[PDB]
Amino acid sequence: KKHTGYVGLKNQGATCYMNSLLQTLFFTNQLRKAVYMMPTEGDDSSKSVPLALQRVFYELQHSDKPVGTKKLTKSFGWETLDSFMQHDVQELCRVLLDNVENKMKGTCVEGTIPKLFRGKMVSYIQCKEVDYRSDRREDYYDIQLSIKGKKNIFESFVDYVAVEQLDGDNKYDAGEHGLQEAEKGVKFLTLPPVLHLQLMRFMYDPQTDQNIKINDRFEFPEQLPLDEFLQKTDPKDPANYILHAVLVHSGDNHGGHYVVYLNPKGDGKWCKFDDDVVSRCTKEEAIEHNYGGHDDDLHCTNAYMLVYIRESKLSEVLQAVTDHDIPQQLVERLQEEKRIEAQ
Amino acid sequence: SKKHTGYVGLKNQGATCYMNSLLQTLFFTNQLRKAVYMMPTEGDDSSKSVPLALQRVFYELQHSDKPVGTKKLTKSFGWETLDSFMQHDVQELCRVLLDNVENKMKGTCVEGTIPKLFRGKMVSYIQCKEVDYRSDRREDYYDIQLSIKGKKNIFESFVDYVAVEQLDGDNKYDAGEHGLQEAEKGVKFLTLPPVLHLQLMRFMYDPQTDQNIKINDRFEFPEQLPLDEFLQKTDPKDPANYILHAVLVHSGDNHGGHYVVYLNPKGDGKWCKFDDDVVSRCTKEEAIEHNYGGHDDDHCTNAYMLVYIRESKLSEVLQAVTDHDIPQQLVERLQEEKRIEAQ
Numbered sequence: 001k002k003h004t005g006y007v008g009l010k011n012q013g014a015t016c017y018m019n020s021l022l023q024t025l026f027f028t029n030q031l032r033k034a035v036y037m038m039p040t041e042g043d044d045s046s047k048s049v050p051l052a053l054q055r056v057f058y059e060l061q062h063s064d065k066p067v068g069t070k071k072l073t074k075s076f077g078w079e080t081l082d083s084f085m086q087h088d089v090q091e092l093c094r095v096l097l098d099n100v101e102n103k104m105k106g107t108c109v110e111g112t113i114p115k116l117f118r119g120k121m122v123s124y125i126q127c128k129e130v131d132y133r134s135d136r137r138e139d140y141y142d143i144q145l146s147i148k149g150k151k152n153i154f155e156s157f158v159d160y161v162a163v164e165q166l167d168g169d170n171k172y173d174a175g176e177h178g179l180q181e182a183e184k185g186v187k188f189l190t191l192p193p194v195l196h197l198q199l200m201r202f203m204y205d206p207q208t209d210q211n212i213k214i215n216d217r218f219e220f221p222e223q224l225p226l227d228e229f230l231q232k233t234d235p236k237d238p239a240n241y242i243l244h245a246v247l248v249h250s251g252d253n254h255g256g257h258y259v260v261y262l263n264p265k266g267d268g269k270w271c272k273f274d275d276d277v278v279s280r281c282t283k284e285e286a287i288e289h290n291y292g293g294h295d296d297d298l299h300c301t302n303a304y305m306l307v308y309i310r311e312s313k314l315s316e317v318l319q320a321v322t323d324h325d326i327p328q329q330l331v332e333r334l335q336e337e338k339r340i341e342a343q
Numbered sequence: 344s345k346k347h348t349g350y351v352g353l354k355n356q357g358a359t360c361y362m363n364s365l366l367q368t369l370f371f372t373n374q375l376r377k378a379v380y381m382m383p384t385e386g387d388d389s390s391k392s393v394p395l396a397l398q399r400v401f402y403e404l405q406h407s408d409k410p411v412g413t414k415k416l417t418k419s420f421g422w423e424t425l426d427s428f429m430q431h432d433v434q435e436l437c438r439v440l441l442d443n444v445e446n447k448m449k450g451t452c453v454e455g456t457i458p459k460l461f462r463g464k465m466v467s468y469i470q471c472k473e474v475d476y477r478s479d480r481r482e483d484y485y486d487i488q489l490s491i492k493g494k495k496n497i498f499e500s501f502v503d504y505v506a507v508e509q510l511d512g513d514n515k516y517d518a519g520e521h522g523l524q525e526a527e528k529g530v531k532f533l534t535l536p537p538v539l540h541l542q543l544m545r546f547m548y549d550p551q552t553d554q555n556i557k558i559n560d561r562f563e564f565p566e567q568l569p570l571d572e573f574l575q576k577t578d579p580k581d582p583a584n585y586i587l588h589a590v591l592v593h594s595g596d597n598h599g600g601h602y603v604v605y606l607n608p609k610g611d612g613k614w615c616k617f618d619d620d621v622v623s624r625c626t627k628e629e630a631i632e633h634n635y636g637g638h639d640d641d642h643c644t645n646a647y648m649l650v651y652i653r654e655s656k657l658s659e660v661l662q663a664v665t666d667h668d669i670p671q672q673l674v675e676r677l678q679e680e681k682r683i684e685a686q
């Protein structure tokens with residue numbers, strides 16, 4: 001642990017992106033502190049997902065040996081390779097963050113999950129020839145960006161908010177106005193302090209009747225200005241984002257190699273987390289080397305998920321955690337477990 | 344205006360002597376402020392509950408741009424008259440306040456925050472010279488009263504504090520079975536807390552007037568204070584190096600004099616003067632050297648209490664506080680309060 005100050009997670013079976021996600025959440029310090037505050041007193045140790053996350057986080061913060069997850073995987077039910085093949089990374093994030101948000105209801109940290117992670121967008125449909133429009137505001141906790149045909153994150157976001165035509169056979173059913181020509185789009189109302197972006201790195205290919213991986217080059221910046229994708233900017237807080245984590249997949253399949261790059265303090269000092277092995281790495285190894293190979297090389301290593309933190313919130317999100325942020329009760333609970341196990 | 348410094352004052356409401364000085368001192372003990380916010384003040388009465396009254400003063404100190412009142416707070420613990428404050432020393436009011444919140448933090452996630460911040464351990468011994476008898480008393484302490492008359496500075500006070508006293512001749516020690524014996528009395532520090540409260544003995548009983556008088560002698564205190572040599576056993580993993588945080592000052596010879604506090608709230612050596620409702624930036628010299636007290640050649644303005652913070656604990660003790668550290672429940676309760684009188 002002393003190489004970097006950070007401890008790894010055991011490779012325990014094939015859980016694909018799990019270890020990567022767990023480190024990403026662990027180093028969302030404000031989330032971690034909120035999780036320690038959950039009132040898991042009466043919870044049963046084997047079935048409680050909130051306690052199990054407390055346990056993983058406690059061990060990540062204090063253990064100098066790699067940390068196990070078997071109680072965690074048992075607690076939310078994904079104990080086989082199939083569970084991870086049949087879910088996307090953001091679905092596992094939703095499973096975990098939903099559990100702890102519900103456990104935080106009625107406590108001092110209620111609402112921590114929404115405040116850190118959920119933004120607001122509006123999706124619209126506008127009829128060209130008649131006076132009819134439909135608006136639906138929608139909350140989101142992650143964004144799935146299209147990469148195929150796009151060179152970088154900015155072009156992905158341009159694509160995401162682009163106006164789409166519904167004419168010809170596409171025509172919009174406008175109800176009492178009949179079939180109409182219209183343009184459909186989405187706009188961002190807000191962006192959250194912690195921004196979870198998944199890249200669409202598998203696409204359904206009819207040729208094989210199965211999904212294949214997209215290995216194309218796709219660039220993302222260390223610093224991400226997003227003000228121009230809001231509907232209305234705030235001069236008092238520009239939507240400037242800072243890269244926190246790069247979740248990486250090497251290979252073409254669920255048998256590939258999953259790792260995560262983080263700079264946990266947000267200072268641009270990066271480490272690579274490869275299950276039990278954590279090592280310091282260059283910024284290039286974390287960012288540019290995970291852009292993905294371009295056509296010429298004749299490279300299946302590339303990012304599928306990025307975490308950005310709003311500039312204006314970085315010091316709050318990444319605020320230091322001391323072991324006095326872990327309640328004595330929980331400390332004793334987990335330390336009792338260690339004594340039972342070691343004998 | 345609060346924008347001068349970012350800090351707001353407390354109203355001068357009658358003669359509460361050192362109270363406003365001590366409230367700012369505690370408010371800028373950030374780790375303690377956050378714990379106080381975490382207290383479960385659901386069902387207590389606003390005019391009866393001291394823990395709720397402290398939350399409310401702290402909440403207003405953190406959010407209001409007008410000076411903050413204290414009548415609800417003084418009413419909740421009973422000191423409504425100048426006599427109430429005249430009869431107690433500063434550390435007694437501190438003890439009253441910290442006792443209330445610590446009791447209220449039992450069973451909660453922040454249980455024990457008060458001892459962790461403020462309590463040290465000392466051992467007091469009497470050792471018989473000529474017979475085999477020794478009496479040892481371990482004791483907790485939350486504050487230290489330092490003698491200043493005849494001492495030039497804090498180091499000489501601490502030298503005095505731990506100096507061995509001879510019990511012989513007419514002040515021989517009653518050693519019980521061993522009769523009257525000659526012995527040596529002393530004190531040793533086992534631990535020093537992260538937040539160190541030092542009262543200077545600036546009032547001494549004088550036989551000439553048969554009453555207490557203020558001692559206005561020069562007594563120097565440093566910005567950095569190494570204390571390792573006063574520990575019975577030192578720790579090479581954490582030296583007892585302390586950083587000056589606050590200087591509580593008195594002007595006059597009288598409880599009718601002027602009470603102010605100087606703080607550098609962030610511990611970065613940028614000082615402000617807190618003069619009830621008026622907070623202003625000041626130089627380091629006005630906070631420290633100007634409060635040493637007039638050297639005889641010539642001043643009744645001087646420090647009576649200093650707060651030091653252990654070097655190794657500064658970033659934890661002074662960890663920044665956002666409004667996310669205040670539970671939404673409590674915010675609503677205090678905002679309902681404010682609307683009722685606003686109308």
Ligand SMILES: Cn1nc2c(=O)n(CC3(O)CCN(Cc4ccc(-c5ncon5)cc4Cl)CC3)cnc2c1-c1ccc(CN)cc1
Binds near residue numbers: 304305
């Ligand atoms: C289109 N799209 N692509 C996505 C994607 O990649 N991710 C990352 C992973 O969830 C999935 C891929 N792994 C790596 C990986 C494993 C095995 C193979 C493989 N096995 C056989 O062949 N190939 C290939 C790969 Cl890249 C990392 C985690 C997440 N969401 C994606 C979406 C999507 C878009 C909209 C919605 C509705 N809002 C829901 C989902």
Ligand SMILES: Cn1nc2c(=O)n(CC3(O)CCN(Cc4ccc(-c5ncon5)cc4Cl)CC3)cnc2c1-c1ccc(CN)cc1
Binds near residue numbers: 434555593596
């Ligand atoms: C000896 N000793 N001195 C102390 C002291 O100064 N403080 C600071 C104050 O509590 C007291 C002084 N005021 C300012 C002040 C007000 C009025 C007059 C005045 N008016 C007319 O005459 N004099 C003069 C002044 Cl300086 C500020 C707060 C606290 N504890 C002190 C002790 C002490 C030592 C051991 C124990 C047992 N552990 C208990 C107490």
